[PDB]
């Protein structure tokens with residue numbers, strides 16, 4: 374009568390044996406594979422720090438080439454000198470950060486950091502922060518040359534490359550990003566990293582949004598956890614760029630199974646499934662600044678995702694980022710202006726043979742539409758199909774070894790996407806990639822019923838991916854191409870076109 378889900382029961386949805394982990398031309402591995410053991414902290418490979426200061430690698434703060442005019446001085450030595458002081462007041466942390474960021478002393482606002490420490494936290498919580506958490510963060514950040522001994526390659530445009538690193542290595546790099554130590558990543562007029570996302574956390578410290586203390590509580594929850602007890606797993610970051618896209622009009626593949634619900638979440642009810650991150654082209658969006666929607670929330674509760682911003686170049690139309698192994702450290706309530714940190718989370722996910730949590734997330738960026746009717750243009754529809762297809766396709770893996778896709782309203786709200794069209798686009802891309810779909814409508818029960826009714830209508834009539842794509846081309850041609858102001862909606866159009874043919 375008032376069903377919370379529709380279609381295939383979620384228990385019938387798919388939730389393989391891994392080859393030996395080793396470095397290769399397309400795979401950077403920063404730990405000792407021969408010494409990888411369950412419950413043991415991974416050993417870095419190589420044993421001693423090796424540096425690369427070039428256009429193809431991350432510029433490390435501990436590099437001997439990280440210099441500053443004084444006679445060129447060592448910025449790493451200045452970083453150590455600045456951070457190894459007693460912090461008793463928020464001004465001390467501000468002053469420390471600015472000693473090696475002198476050019477931004479008038480541009481960087483620290484209001485949110487000062488208000489969190491002085492006006493949000495109770496006396497005992499502020500004391501625990503500066504007596505235990507901040508000194509423990511400084512120590513793991515300053516351990517960077519002994520932890521991250523191998524150069525980290527940039528996951529540049531058109532590269533099909535993977536990075537497997539430890540959760541411990543990520544914690545050292547993230548503590549550095551908090552203390553804003555990454556060089557060449559700050560200038561507004563920078564050229565070298567203009568197409569890369571921000572990594573240093575300075576924009577998290579600015580202004581008076583009520584959401585900043587919530588972001589800070591979520592990040593300090595993570596930092597408290599990883600400095601008290603070193604995490605033992607690995608995380609893989611894969612940049613995927615497809616060369617060959619399907620000729621959608623000719624696709625003879627039938628639709629796959631659907632589970633659609635207005636209750637639940639991707640991270641809780643999509644366990645063991647490929648989880649979609651409704652990404653911005655610069656991965657993580659405004660996680661280190663003001664943004665607090667779907668992507669930023671996932672990046673806060675699974676902070677290991679944030680390090681993708683260090684080495685992931687802006688995604689092109691034919692690219693996506695696949696992150697395997699991130700751990701959930703926090704629980705939350707609300708969304709956007711109502712987001713609140715709830716408590717610490719003990720991730721119960723099992724680990725695979727590479728010691729990675731069994732959590733696979735794909736970042737796929739939807740297009741932003743200035744006008745509503747722009748999304749119905751064939752080129753724009755083909756773009757969204759190819760994007761979702763790239764995120765879902767696992768070249769070399771057979772259908773029976775592919776889990777269902779756990780997704781929802783991709784590119785909705787601010788980006789101007791039509792939920793009914795985007796749902797069809799994802800259903801079609803999942804069909805071409807031969808995966809089943811688990812779709813979350815986040816409280817919209819009417820959308821759940823419409824997606825279900827459309828999917829069951831097309832399935833019963835045995836319409837292929839090609840048949841559905843051709844119907845989308847007809848809708849543009851009949852109702853959008855000559856439209857000046859649409860007159861009829863997409864789903865009624867589809868039912869009419871099929872039932873009257």
Ligand SMILES: Cc1nc(C)c(Cn2c(=O)n(Cc3cnn(C)c3)c(=O)c3cc(S(O)(O)NC4(C)CC4)ccc32)s1
Nearest residue numbers: 635636637638639640667670671708782814815816817
């Ligand atoms: C059962 C519910 N109801 C509401 C209102 C909810 C909050 N919420 C919401 O509002 N939106 C906007 C929206 C879009 N379409 N609609 C209709 C709303 C979401 O996108 C959304 C996404 C997720 S999620 O499962 O992706 N998990 C993360 C946030 C990544 C970690 C969770 C909650 C969300 S969850």
